[PDB]
Write an enzyme that holds these catalytic residues in place. Structure first.
Site, PDB file in Angstrom:
ATOM      1  N   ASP A 290      12.842 -15.241 -19.560  1.00  0.00           N
ATOM      2  CA  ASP A 290      12.403 -14.150 -18.566  1.00  0.00           C
ATOM      3  C   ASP A 290      12.614 -14.399 -17.209  1.00  0.00           C
ATOM      4  OD1 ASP A 290      11.882 -12.324 -20.713  1.00  0.00           O
ATOM      5  OD2 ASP A 290       9.293 -12.629 -20.439  1.00  0.00           O
ATOM      6  N   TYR A 299      12.094  -7.062 -11.587  1.00  0.00           N
ATOM      7  CA  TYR A 299      11.384  -6.148 -12.248  1.00  0.00           C
ATOM      8  C   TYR A 299       9.812  -5.911 -11.756  1.00  0.00           C
ATOM      9  CZ  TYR A 299      15.699  -6.304 -14.848  1.00  0.00           C
ATOM     10  OH  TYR A 299      16.970  -6.312 -15.086  1.00  0.00           O
ATOM     11  N   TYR A 374       7.278  -5.949 -22.797  1.00  0.00           N
ATOM     12  CA  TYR A 374       6.279  -6.645 -22.241  1.00  0.00           C
ATOM     13  C   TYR A 374       6.053  -6.745 -20.716  1.00  0.00           C
ATOM     14  CZ  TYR A 374       5.038  -9.482 -26.314  1.00  0.00           C
ATOM     15  OH  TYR A 374       4.492  -9.954 -27.514  1.00  0.00           O
ATOM     16  N   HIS A 423       5.368 -15.123 -32.379  1.00  0.00           N
ATOM     17  CA  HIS A 423       6.139 -15.734 -31.135  1.00  0.00           C
ATOM     18  C   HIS A 423       5.569 -16.462 -30.308  1.00  0.00           C
ATOM     19  CE1 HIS A 423       4.351 -11.966 -30.008  1.00  0.00           C
ATOM     20  NE2 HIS A 423       4.334 -12.357 -28.965  1.00  0.00           N
TER      21      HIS A 423
HETATM   22 CU   LIG Z   1       3.028 -11.972 -27.332  1.00  0.00          CU
END
Ligand SMILES: [Cu+2]
Ligand SMILES: [Cu+2]
Ligand code: NA
EC number: 1.4.3.21
Lengths: 620, 620
Positions: A290, A299, A374, A423
């Site tokens: 990210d 962002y 997310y 994850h």
């Molecule tokens: Cu997660």
């Protein structure tokens, strides 16, 4: 006046003009990254020189460039052409996201795959995801994105409830070609909606919550000067912002009597990776960097008073560049406030009759970013007693898949037919240490158990051991929760009144590190995530644990190559890199929008002060 | 009304009258413990029968007794004579603490030791500490306290700054005899004062802190009925108080639509041990069982509005018995309030355009206790999202010693000549589980790493495994932070809408457990502290991990004896015992009064609900 001031709109405008006048910002050029450079090491630096680093992408396919400009003098310092097959591709551009869905909408293989599933192409959203480096030789030197599909039943629908499994496409976003469309089989598209504002799903809203009112009738206890310089309860620091890293803290120091004592020169989250553990070929390539690939600062959310930040709030509104060099303000992108933090110290003494209670407080500096599904909150905390703490808050919507008939060892079921692949979310904190100055060392501290015997006849003794890390090749360390392992950063040349070196202790959460196989692509590209602690000798150009160009870089960049220099770190200018993360096996309660989960670390004084530093806090 | 109501002053007076009438509470008797018994298993059952358990000490040396009384019926249910050399001594009486210093002040061995050090006996305070079980055969069956000396320069002086090392005495507090005085040599008494309210030490108080005002203009969101029944944001529970355990939570349940779903039948801190790791004979016997030996509820503080508890506070004032059976109220001994807790859930969706933010809150139930130099805060938290958390806050004044001239491997230096021995603070939480009812089981969950190869060609997959604990002999478990180990408590007969058993996951902090040699006295007496998790089958009389009578009791009671029954725990009425603690290597910053440090655990729903339970939280 301060070299650490936030970049201004005028500064970014002047960068644009300099690049333009120099012939480096034509109509086919795009700015993929722009940020201010920190001042180089120099405890006598008087001349103001504000320098910016720029990554320039070319939409026509020509080689990209890395440029450094001086806005003070109006000059280009250097410009290098980049060979991306060797050193990595530039970060993903916001404008490349739309390209993936539009290109696929006219590809006959994509349309054929959707027709077999009776899906209207106008309702299929495509998540544009970074590609990584795998087995496809034709991808080297090309800017690739991979697309996974989700159905949006209507414009306000949550597409994440409707993954289209068994289908993935690869796209060259420069030449606008769909390179592969892989269809492994038809899975039912999960039909339940996940619309968390739909009354059909929420039910009647609660009427039982009464207001909590937090006010500061005399204003906050901290001051802000020069735009971003904070003074609060003996702390002193500068709040920076970078489009890649987000909020950066500079010059963290503590006023101990007459002296301003440095603690941390620069603190940031220098990388964060989200590797997925589903072996299906539809997702086995999926790893988000990210910070390094997407740039979390660009962002950042505008934070709303009373909802995101509650209390007496002071905002900063950082300025970044868009893809053409125009300044863009992120209004109310950083919240700062203090908050009560319970009891600081308390004792009721029988013999003296004195009853003593003091309250604690912390200063909060925060921002929130959204990358697709997310949302991450980044929180820095400063406490009265000298503690520094970082906390990441993970929320948003989990990434989904089909839930296979017969179950899965790598996917959780959230709803009928709806899965969520396992994850991790792993962060790297880069702490450029300056404990009472730049001459620092790191010691690893383990608890020592002792055997019953001579000198320990009742078998009650225990102790501790400290090991100095003296060179970079021995400064790659693993956690050991069972032995209470911590790391101490000390200054061997600066002693407290007991003639002991002053220091700070790093307390980790001891969560699992990267789970992928050591031979995997992600283990090579995210090598930092395989160990809990790294220590390097400071160098100007060693900024990120994954290197400068993370997108589609083959591996080994960053920390493994820095550490290989095997430099002296015993009483030197050093940088601590701490890996910490969450391992996420999604639960039903994470659906359809996930309650916050957290991870972090903290640093506590360890003989830095000559006694408790909060004896002068009043009773109030 | 409720069988779980707090004991009232009238109930305690009635117990006194019943015991008197029965001939069990004449003038030589003292009440060492008195508490209400929980209802036996069975709905309705005894309609109303409030029973009290009493430990009765005899100051003339006769055998003590354990008595059960029915206050409803006015009868003694059972009364048994105790053989303390076998089953343990009764808890220490508050009146016995004063005895120690007074007896030593007239003992010629004590006076000779003080004269050798030029100390005025009128200025020497004696800390009266529990004795444990060691090599002294004359102590078997006698009530012994051990005394360590500290100098108080003036009545308001902090005596902890001036330990008198090299000296310890043992006292029989029933026959009023000094059994031994041990003098291992003269150490300098550290001379610096530790008076944290002295302006000479604090300096001028800060004037920079501005007020933080926390108010609830419409009152709190929770309701209290029947004196101690709480309803708050779908949670339902009863707050109990016991003089040994302190605050006890009963009947923790969550209202899920139409149904009140049980989660925890009874939660308490059932023991807490503070072992010291200094092998000096002056202190190598030192181990506090604050719960079992001293009774932490007896020493609960009265909490002051605005200092100890801040906000809109609801207080409970529990009633306990004094040593003669008279009721004593601990005014404002329990604080209850709700607190803002930041962001609960947040997502900004590109595709739907919906921006969504909700805030979290928690309910706080707390009390504070003071045991000599140490002060401990006990905090229970309930969160909107179904999370339950406990946190212990340790503060107060560290226990001191001399710092030996040539250094020490087992003691920290705090000030010139002043040391602080290494120690731990270890807690046992007893969680009588009732996840959707009483048919529960525990599974241990570990992360599983997978090798690159067939079915995992890219080396990215990872998974998890769950192992059911089926019998008590296999339910003594250790932490493993490296493999992300957690424990799930589930109900195999109650499924969520995905046909999976409902459950809650226990997240430990994975701190070191007891460090002492496994052959030591403390390892035998505090065997619970050597392992992170124990699971037993519920039994009425299995209340404490250390047994009923901890004071001067050898091993042979508590958790190791319970688990030898090897009972079925797979889908049964079970109890989870979680060990967690702090390992304290004191730092200079802990002196002269220690800033709070914390440790705890939390439980989070794991497919207990059919989706997120906080979808009906309003924006507001
Ligand atoms: Cu997660
Ligand atoms: Cu301690
Ligand atoms: Na149970």
């Amino acid at each position: 006046a301060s070299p650490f001031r936030l970049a201004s709109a005028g500064e970014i405008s002047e960068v644009q003009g300099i690049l333009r006048t120099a012939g480096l910002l034509g109509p086919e050029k795009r700015i993929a990254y722009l940020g201010v450079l920190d001042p180089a090491r120099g405890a006598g630096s008087e001349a103001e020189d504000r320098r910016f680093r720029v990554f320039i992408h070319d939409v026509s396919g020509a080689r990209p460039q890395e440029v450094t400009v001086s806005v003070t003098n109006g000059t280009v310092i250097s410009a290098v052409e980049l060979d991306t097959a060797a050193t990595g591709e530039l970060p993903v551009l916001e404008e490349e996201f739309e390209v993936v869905e539009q290109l696929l909408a006219t590809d006959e293989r994509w349309l054929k795959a959707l027709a077999a599933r009776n899906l209207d192409v106008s309702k299929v959203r495509v998540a544009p995801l970074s590609a990584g480096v795998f087995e496809y030789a034709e991808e080297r030197g090309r800017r690739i994105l991979r697309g996974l599909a989700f159905v949006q039943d209507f414009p306000e629908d949550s597409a994440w409830a409707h993954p289209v499994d068994g289908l993935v496409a690869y796209v060259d976003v420069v030449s606008k070609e769909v390179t592969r469309v892989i269809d492994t089989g038809v899975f039912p598209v999960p039909a339940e909606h996940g619309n968390y504002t739909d009354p059909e799903l929420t039910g009647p809203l609660r009427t039982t919550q009464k207001p909590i009112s937090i006010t500061q009738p005399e204003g906050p206890s901290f001051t802000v000067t020069g735009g971003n310089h904070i003074e609060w309860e003996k702390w002193s620091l500068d709040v920076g912002f970078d489009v890649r890293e987000g909020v950066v803290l500079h010059n963290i120091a503590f006023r101990d009597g007459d002296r301003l004592r440095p603690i941390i020169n620069r603190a940031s989250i220098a990388e964060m990776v989200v590797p997925y553990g589903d072996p299906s070929p539809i997702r086995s390539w999926q790893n988000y960097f990210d910070t390094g690939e997407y740039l979390v600062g660009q962002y950042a959310n505008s934070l709303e008073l009373g909802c995101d930040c509650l209390g007496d709030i002071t905002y900063l509104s950082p300025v970044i560049s868009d893809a053409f060099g125009n300044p863009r303000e992120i209004r109310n992108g950083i919240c700062m406030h203090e908050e009560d933090w319970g009891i600081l110290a308390k004792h009721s003494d029988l013999w003296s009759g004195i009853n003593y209670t003091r309250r604690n407080r912390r200063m909060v500096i925060s921002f929130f970013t959204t990358i697709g599904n997310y949302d991450y909150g980044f929180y820095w905390y400063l406490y009265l007693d000298g503690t520094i703490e970082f906390e990441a808050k993970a929320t948003g919507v989990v990434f989904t898949s089909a839930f296979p008939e017969g179950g899965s060892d790598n996917i959780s079921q959230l709803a009928p037919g709806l899965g969520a692949p396992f994850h991790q979310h792993i962060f790297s904190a880069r702490l450029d240490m300056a404990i009472d100055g730049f001459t620092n060392r790191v010691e690893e501290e383990d608890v020592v158990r002792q055997t019953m015997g001579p000198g320990n006849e009742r078998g009650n003794a225990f102790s501790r051991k400290r090991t100095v890390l003296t060179r970079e090749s021995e400064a790659v360390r693993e956690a050991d929760a069972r032995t209470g392992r911590t790391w101490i950063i000390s200054n061997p040349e600066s002693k407290n009144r007991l003639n002991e070196p002053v220091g700070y202790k790093l307390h980790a959460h001891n969560q699992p590190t990267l789970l992928a196989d050591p031979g995997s692509s992600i283990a090579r590209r995210a090598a930092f995530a395989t160990k809990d602690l790294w220590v390097t000798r400071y160098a100007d150009d060693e900024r990120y644990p994954t290197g400068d160009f993370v997108n589609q870089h083959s591996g080994g960049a960053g920390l493994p190559s820095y550490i290989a220099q095997d430099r002296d770190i015993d009483g030197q200018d050093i940088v601590v890199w701490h890996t910490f993360g969450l391992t996420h096996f999604p639960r039903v309660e994470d659906w359809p929008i996930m309650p916050v989960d957290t991870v972090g670390f903290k640093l506590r004084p360890e003989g830095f002060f000559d006694r408790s530093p909060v004896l002068d806090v009043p009773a109030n």
